[PDB]
Design a protein around this ligand. Structure first.
Ligand SMILES: O=C(CN1C[C@@H](C(=O)Nc2cncc3ccccc23)c2cc(Cl)ccc2C1=O)NC1COC1
Ligand SMILES: [Cl-]
Lengths: 296, 305
């Protein structure tokens, strides 16, 4: 029993965090094999980069200074070739995630990890993280068996307190650029397939007060979802919720009628899994994984 | 900016998790130096759980009855002893991944990270608090026994909890790393229930200061309160009494924001009376009590927005 916002164990990522210094700027780097990946803003980026030499970049791994032997740029990420391969390099992949998918963040400062938390890529491509000055280069990831899938690298904070960054190939998530200019997050929406997954998790943990005898059509549900700034529910989302529907005996459109009733009426002083708001940062897979016992 | 329920990086603890098997039972163990610590109920059958005599069960065991697995390697047990509700298995190999550590017993209201494990393999990390009724609201399934709670301050891991059981309401009970339970619980399948739980007042106040630091002040008012009047009101909403120690502990946050503890206590009184009115505080519609005054100072900026 119990339902917490759970992050993946961060050990395999902690062994890759390094500190990168260029002039007066200091941020975090990801050391994988003989390459250190970090935001290019540590330094017209090609014009600034051509003026730099290898020794201008100071890389620190714990108490050891790594020697930079090369440097190149890939989109908004800087790749620093170092003399030493990381002996702690885990099995890994670089993957780009979609809005609604969740991941763990290892927040770092000066190449030292300070905390781990779980979050989701919002529909407006921002993340509601917890970052202070010096956190740039902190990374987001998932684990499949023994393989670490790196999906995010932190680059900046927007005026509303939300965060923007790139995949590990340097492509930003969202219409953002790496520079101090007028940038705002677009109007955000609720991740509908995730709220439904969390309502199934509540039923599994014995919370059924919100269930009703009714069903809805997919079109009627989406007409109500569009009114409450909820992301449209697709047939793919319904198919993905299939195993949870079979486990609890509540058809996806049956659960949509419960959510429609919660959107028009609220909770009435009641809570679901200890929350007074409808929670959208748990995917259908996170619910199955936490209510099964999958290890790494 | 931002405020999340953050756990400590779990790497130093992952390198200590092992699987302990005794007969048909399998649970998690903590391998530190040449000792593996695990719940003593690993020597029980489900039948023995009603009225177990642990000393009588333990004397019938020899070293080779305990199977310890660290990854793909089998550790050899060379000794065993009991300390309260924890079993200590002496192994022939010291853990090369042993971090700098201490065993600390925490008080209710204190927070810690939990590394949930099954078969000696870590599956997730989350942050939680020791409730006033000595239980934890964790997320644990069958096989999670022996999972541990900890804090990492500087580079030293402070082990404070080891998971032992789930109560009928779905909450969890366990011990410190010396085997002393938190709460009036026993490692018996006896009809025991968690006492009525209460809200950790000093933590809610800390979180209201964190909201002011991140630029939110809609809940403040022009009133103050006496400590006694605050406690007379808060106890009616099942809030833990606020002591002078709690007020002293909130001193640095009061100096940083310019809001006296008894003025913050007056906004809390009003929040309990009126509710939120469709508003949120740090993205929450409920008053959050699982962040200590120390956690707020650690996570939030030193400069108030
Ligand atoms: O009934 C039982 C079975 N069970 C075994 C074990 C125990 O509580 N294990 C577990 C730990 N953490 C989470 C769990 C989630 C689901 C199932 C077992 C869990 C135990 C240990 C001790 Cl020290 C005392 C009593 C018991 C005991 O009763 N417990 C719960 C109440 O609903 C299932
Ligand atoms: Cl304490």
């Amino acid at each position: 029993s119990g339902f917490r916002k759970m992050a993946f164990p961060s050990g395999k990522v902690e062994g890759c965090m390094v500190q990168v210094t260029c002039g007066t700027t200091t941020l975090n780097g990801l050391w994988l094999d003989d390459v250190v990946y970090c935001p290019r803003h540590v330094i017209n980026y090609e014009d600034l980069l051509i003026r730099k030499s290898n020794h201008n970049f100071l890389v620190q791994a714990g108490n050891v200074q790594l020697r930079v032997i090369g440097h190149s740029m890939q989109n908004c990420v800087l790749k620093l070739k170092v003399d030493t391969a990381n002996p702690k390099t885990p099995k890994y992949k670089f993957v780009r995630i979609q809005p609604g998918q969740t991941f763990s963040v290892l927040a770092c400062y000066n190449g030292s990890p300070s905390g781990v938390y779980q979050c989701a890529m919002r529909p407006n491509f921002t993340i509601k993280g917890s970052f202070l000055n010096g956190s740039c280069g902190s990374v987001g990831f998932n684990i499949d068996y023994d393989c670490v899938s790196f999906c995010y690298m932190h680059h900046m904070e927007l005026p509303t307190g939300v965060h923007a960054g790139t995949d590990l190939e340097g492509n930003f998530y969202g219409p953002f650029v790496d520079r101090q200019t007028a940038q705002a997050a677009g109007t955000d929406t609720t991740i509908t397939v995730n709220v439904l997954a969390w309502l199934y998790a509540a039923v599994i943990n014995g919370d059924r007060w919100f269930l009703n005898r009714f069903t809805t059509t997919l079109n009627d549900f989406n007409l109500v979802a569009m009114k409450y700034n909820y992301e449209p529910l697709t047939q793919d989302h319904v198919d993905i919720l299939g195993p949870l529907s079979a486990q609890t005996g509540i058809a996806v459109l049956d659960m949509c009628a419960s959510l429609k009733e919660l959107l028009q009426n609220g909770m009435n002083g009641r809570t679901i899994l200890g929350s007074a708001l409808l929670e959208d940062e748990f995917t259908p897979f996170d619910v199955v994984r936490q209510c099964s016992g999958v290890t790494f």
